[PDB]
Design a protein around this ligand. Structure first.
Ligand SMILES: [Mg+2]
Ligand SMILES: [Mg+2]
Ligand SMILES: [Mg+2]
Ligand SMILES: [Mg+2]
Ligand SMILES: [Mg+2]
Ligand SMILES: [Mg+2]
Ligand SMILES: [Mg+2]
Ligand SMILES: [Mg+2]
Ligand SMILES: [Mg+2]
Ligand SMILES: [Mg+2]
Ligand SMILES: [Mg+2]
Ligand SMILES: [Mg+2]
Ligand SMILES: [Mg+2]
Ligand SMILES: [Mg+2]
Ligand SMILES: [Mg+2]
Ligand SMILES: [Mg+2]
Ligand SMILES: [Mg+2]
Ligand SMILES: [Mg+2]
Ligand SMILES: [Mg+2]
Ligand SMILES: [Mg+2]
Ligand SMILES: [Mg+2]
Ligand SMILES: [Mg+2]
Ligand SMILES: [Mg+2]
Ligand SMILES: [Mg+2]
Ligand SMILES: [Mg+2]
Ligand SMILES: [Mg+2]
Ligand SMILES: [Mg+2]
Lengths: 234, 122, 147, 52, 187
RNA sequence: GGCGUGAAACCGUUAAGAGGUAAACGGGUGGGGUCCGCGCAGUCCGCCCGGAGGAUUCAACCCGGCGGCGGGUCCGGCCGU
RNA sequence: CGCCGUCGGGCCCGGGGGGCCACGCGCGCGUCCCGGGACGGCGGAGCGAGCGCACGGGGUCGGCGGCGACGUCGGCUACCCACCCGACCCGUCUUGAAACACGGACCAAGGAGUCUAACACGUGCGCGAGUCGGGGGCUCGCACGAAAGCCGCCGUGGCGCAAUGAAGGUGAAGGCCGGCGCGCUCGCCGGCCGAGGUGGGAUCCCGAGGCCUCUCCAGUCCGCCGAGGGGCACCACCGGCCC
RNA sequence: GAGCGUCGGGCCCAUACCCGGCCGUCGCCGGCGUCGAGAGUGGACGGGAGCGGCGGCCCGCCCGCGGACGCUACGCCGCGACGAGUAGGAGGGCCGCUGCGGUGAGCCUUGAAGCCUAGGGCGCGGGCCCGGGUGGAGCCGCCGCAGGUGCAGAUCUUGGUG
């Protein structure tokens, strides 16, 4: 009738509203995508800077005949070695707190003097050492599983990290890498965001699983050689 | 109180068959055979059923009158259709869609009207 | 219903829900109230304190028959009459009052609570309690004994 | 609380001019639950004690 | 294996009501629709209480509902109690207040309608306040059962206020050894 | 002539198969036998259109007439509250 | 003071190849460098149509193809047999059973947590300060009727509403504004509502506050909402009242 | 060295660990919008002034009559981690037997019950349905109700054969 034909003249105004609504959604997420492009530029400038600083600091120390010692690294990757049956009461509780409840799954651990004395208590049950950037670069990408209510969801996208974790300013995946790698002020809630890294059994085989890595075996601290192991278990 | 009639009859009715598989409705007015809420034809005020033609050729269609409830002699009005398998396909589409009379269960009326002619034509 | 039981579930199982090791036999701890003082004092005391001994005077041929007085409180006091009368006791008249009789409804002693209706009354009873009698004197009512 | 009228049929399946108002029991709740409880117990009164 | 943890995995919360009442089964069908589709938290709580059993839905006596409606600012809201509302003959004033219950008792229906008030149920309650807007929720004395005075630490230990089980009260029933000091110990 | 149906233990013969670590059993295929199913490479079913060949009667579009659903004044009454 | 640093600060700088998710002149809205440049806004003004194709892009499709009959095609089992590897005989007591521990030759049928009372918690249903016909009576004596229906001036009674004490027995309302005495270790007199208080406390209400195309100018409106409010059930604690 | 010791690189396999299929349990969920016409993380107006642009002569549904499946609400769908079990406790059973009201316009001398079965299958399983053979007169489903209701065992009872 004359009233509905009056709205079909007004429908060209209506689909302008349909155009406009799809439109700002397009140009949010476009300029929200341009943001993620330049924050990674800033990090790729940054990790080059922090890496080459430790070379550049040491090289002008050795020139003047003086030892450089680096800061004791503040982030350790921990993977569990042994099993479940036959577990002491004191180490029962501790491996719960480090999210290592089954075998061969692991997390990151904020190193600190409160956290160091945990890792003496569970010395036979874990293998641990300071990672590299390349190791963390692989784990969040290949084995990134994150929980939201419960229910670990594979990451697969930056919208998952925008809602569940970007309360502080870490909306995308490379912000998650910087906060994990350089321990900042929000490492706690980024580390709680990740589910434990359910790795594989190692490729080459371990070495005796029980003695310390000082004793030639495999348990305990190893300080860079866990980069050698995390290529196997990934 | 149609849902009152459903919450009584949805089990413990008569002509309900539970053998080897799903329930079956087996009710005198229904298109599909399921004991369901939507394909249930004693309950609703507005029901659509098609049947065979005891004349031998054709499709008869059963609709409830909606004027007088609780008066089961006069509560049904029926009409037969014997056409050329395509106009009797559209006429049942016209009578369902071009009224408010159950726009739900359009296709199930037709698929039975589809199927019952092919049982009847050769 | 023997079709809703525990027995009909436990067929197929050997000990029928009473233990292989302890062996449900006949009457292990005696029959009934056996050994209340001896080996079931942690049951009798801590669950039925005071079960053993004497306290009081004996009374021979105790009839429940010279101690009969069903009570009432001043909540239920208006509920013996149709509340037609408490309207027509509130109808601004004078100190005219309904004579509520609790002996008719079966109630002998009138105990007390607080908060009685403001309108004046006359209660006819066999026994009163002085708090309740302080309440009927509060509203300007009266207090009549029947014998 | 709104109660229709029901006709009074003749001896031939045919209406008469008299019409009765539908009494209020036919608006009351339909509870096959309470029927299934009460029918289950009232059927049991029937039985004899049956051999010992 | 995974857990050096236990398993307390399955909650005990009631999900469908054990009752087979058709009319309760339609109020559940109506209210399970609402509580997921309104972003309201009233409609959660009523939907819990329709599930709930008959012990845990104790009856409002009529004068609790009055004394919890005359509290200030609440003269203008409508009371909702899931469960039965019975009558109190302790009181004399009955105001014109609004009531929304399951199965108001019969002598309580008259004393509302004498007072000119309005009664509803949950088929009618859903139309006015689907979100529960303007509606005070109440509930009866859940501990107010007779039984719940039996439940304490024990019936004899520091006397514990227990009401012990006994075949009838009087003299010569649970009085000598434990209930007084001269006859042994005084708990 | 303890005469209805007549199971199992056990035994008789016929048929088939096997035979040094007592028999039997689980997992795995294999061989044979058995019937079964298909019809043995020869198996798709119905839908739509553009083509070929015979017959029927529309749809529209109106008039004929029945029945039905869908709306507002409360419209024309009742009754509802 | 210089000296070392693929340093860093996007420093700046003044002229004179790579590279960059980088594109308004026409001149204006501020800063800055000695006019351009950068921008938060507007003064410039992204002069939209996505129209097409690829797709390491939200778990494979072929719009690929063959080869075989009247004794051969496929097949699964409580059928047999071969073979590899695994493999002690079931119930029972038991710290432990293949046990040099016990019962068990073999088949068929029979065969072992029941019912009444009573109490307790839990749960469904009916009623609700009430509830209950359970014992009787009324219906015509109608197969099912040894059922069912009714009573109510049949509610006697049971259980509950009230407790405590050996017993005589007594038997559960305070709060607010004034007054009288030395207004005190101190009780009484008159109004006005009438079950106290504190911390917790689901839900509900009030919500400052901003949020949606030029602009003003205006009421509905949806959602977020700081903080605030009367506060259920219930728990912890104080006060009070009866014996 | 096929011994002992100190060792290196390979290589071997567990129901463990990774990844994938599947069942079930548990948690957290979703659809009454069956809406081919609904599209709302913000939506109506008539005003007083405006330009980006539809018409400057610088002034205002329907060629098609059409569109799959769903939703036993105790139905279905989605995502995720989980599974050992004696004594024991709960839950689900369209598991079976026998009897009773209800229903199946059920079933059958044109062959019911049973019983046998190198016959065809279904279910994880309890157990069932189908064919063939025997026999010759009654029997089973579904919703409820009620059990003297489910065997390998008791130096089991009685019967029967090695
Ligand atoms: Mg070990
Ligand atoms: Mg290898
Ligand atoms: Mg090794
Ligand atoms: Mg057991
Ligand atoms: Mg037990
Ligand atoms: Mg012992
Ligand atoms: Mg025992
Ligand atoms: Mg005794
Ligand atoms: Mg596991
Ligand atoms: Mg014979
Ligand atoms: Mg014979
Ligand atoms: Mg015969
Ligand atoms: Mg043994
Ligand atoms: Mg011996
Ligand atoms: Mg033996
Ligand atoms: Mg023996
Ligand atoms: Mg037997
Ligand atoms: Mg009970
Ligand atoms: Mg009495
Ligand atoms: Mg298990
Ligand atoms: Mg059967
Ligand atoms: Mg059967
Ligand atoms: Mg029997
Ligand atoms: Mg028996
Ligand atoms: Mg056994
Ligand atoms: Mg024996
Ligand atoms: Mg012999």
């Amino acid at each position: 009738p004359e009233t509905l034909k009056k709205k079909r003249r007004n429908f060209a105004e209506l689909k302008i509203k349909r155009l406009r609504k799809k439109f700002a959604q397009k140009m949010l997420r476009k300029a929200r995508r341009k943001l993620i492009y330049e924050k990674a530029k800033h990090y790729h400038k940054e990790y080059r800077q922090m890496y080459r600083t430790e070379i550049r600091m040491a090289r002008m120390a050795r020139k003047a005949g003086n030892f450089y010692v680096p800061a004791e690294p503040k982030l350790a990757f921990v993977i569990r070695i042994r099993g479940i049956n036959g577990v002491s009461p004191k180490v029962r509780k501790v491996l719960q707190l480090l999210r290592l409840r089954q075998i061969f799954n692991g997390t990151f651990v904020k190193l600190n003097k409160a956290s160091i004395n945990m890792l003496r208590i569970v010395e036979p049950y874990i293998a641990w050492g300071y990672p590299n950037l390349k190791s963390v670069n692989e784990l969040i990408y290949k084995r990134g599983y994150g929980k939201i209510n419960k229910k670990r969801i594979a990451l697969t996208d930056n919208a998952l990290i925008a809602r569940s974790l970007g309360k502080y300013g870490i909306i995308c995946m490379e912000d998650l890498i910087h906060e994990i790698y350089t321990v900042g002020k929000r490492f706690k809630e980024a580390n709680n965001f990740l589910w434990p890294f359910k790795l594989s059994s190692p490729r080459g085989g371990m070495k005796k699983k029980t003695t310390h890595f000082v004793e030639g075996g495999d348990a305990g601290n190893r300080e860079d050689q866990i980069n050698r192991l995390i290529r196997r278990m990934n | 109180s149609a849902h009152l009639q459903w919450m009584v009859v949805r089990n413990c009715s008569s002509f309900l068959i539970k053998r080897n598989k799903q329930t079956y409705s087996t009710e005198p007015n229904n298109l599909k055979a399921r004991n369901s809420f939507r394909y249930n034809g004693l309950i609703h005020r507005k029901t659509v059923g098609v049947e065979p033609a005891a004349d031998g050729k054709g499709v008869v269609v059963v609709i409830k009158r909606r004027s007088g409830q609780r008066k089961p002699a006069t509560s049904y009005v029926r009409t037969t259709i014997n056409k050329n398998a395509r106009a009797t396909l559209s006429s049942i589409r016209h009578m369902i869609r071009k009224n408010k009379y159950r726009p739900d269960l359009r296709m199930a009326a037709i698929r039975r009207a589809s199927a019952i002619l092919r049982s009847q034509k050769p | 219903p023997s079709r809703l039981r525990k027995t009909r579930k436990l067929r197929g199982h050997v000990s029928h829900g009473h233990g292989r090791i302890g062996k449900h036999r006949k009457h292990p701890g005696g029959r009934g109230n056996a050994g209340g003082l001896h080996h079931h004092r942690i049951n009798f005391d801590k669950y039925h304190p005071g079960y053993f001994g004497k306290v009081g005077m004996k009374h021979y041929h105790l009839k429940r028959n010279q101690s009969f007085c069903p009570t009432v409180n001043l909540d239920k006091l208006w509920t013996l009459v149709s509340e037609q009368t408490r309207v027509n006791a509130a109808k601004n008249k004078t100190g005219a009052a309904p004579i509520i009789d609790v002996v008719r409804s079966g109630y002998y002693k009138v105990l007390g609570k607080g908060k009685l209706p403001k309108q004046p009354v006359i209660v006819k009873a066999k026994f009163f309690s002085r708090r309740a009698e302080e309440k009927i004197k509060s509203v300007g009512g009266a207090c009549v004994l029947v014998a | 609380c709104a109660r229709p009228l029901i006709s009074v049929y003749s001896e031939k399946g045919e209406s008469s001019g008299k019409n009765v108002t539908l009494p209020a029991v036919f608006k009351a709740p339909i509870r096959p639950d309470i029927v299934n409880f009460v029918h289950t117990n009232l059927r049991k009164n029937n039985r004899q004690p049956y051999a010992v | 294996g995974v857990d050096i943890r236990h398993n307390k995995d399955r909650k005990v919360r009631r999900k469908e009501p054990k009752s087979q009442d058709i009319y309760l089964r339609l109020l559940v069908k109506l209210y399970r629709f609402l509580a997921r589709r309104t972003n309201s938290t009233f409609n959660q709580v009523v939907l819990k209480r329709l599930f709930m059993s008959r012990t845990n839905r104790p009856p409002l006596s009529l004068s609790r509902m009055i004394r919890k409606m005359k509290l200030p600012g609440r003269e203008n809201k409508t009371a909702v109690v899931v469960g039965t509302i019975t009558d109190d003959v302790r009181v004399q004033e009955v105001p014109k207040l609004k009531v929304c219950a399951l199965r108001v008792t019969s002598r309580a229906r008259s004393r509302i309608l004498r007072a000119g008030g309005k009664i509803l149920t949950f088929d009618q309650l859903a139309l006015d306040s689907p979100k529960g807007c303007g509606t005070v929720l109440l509930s009866g004395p859940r501990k107010g059962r007779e039984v719940y005075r039996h439940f304490g630490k024990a019936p004899g230990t520091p006397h514990s206020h227990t009401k012990p089980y006994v075949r009838s009260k009087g003299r010569k029933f649970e009085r000598a050894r434990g209930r007084r000091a001269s006859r042994g110990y005084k708990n």
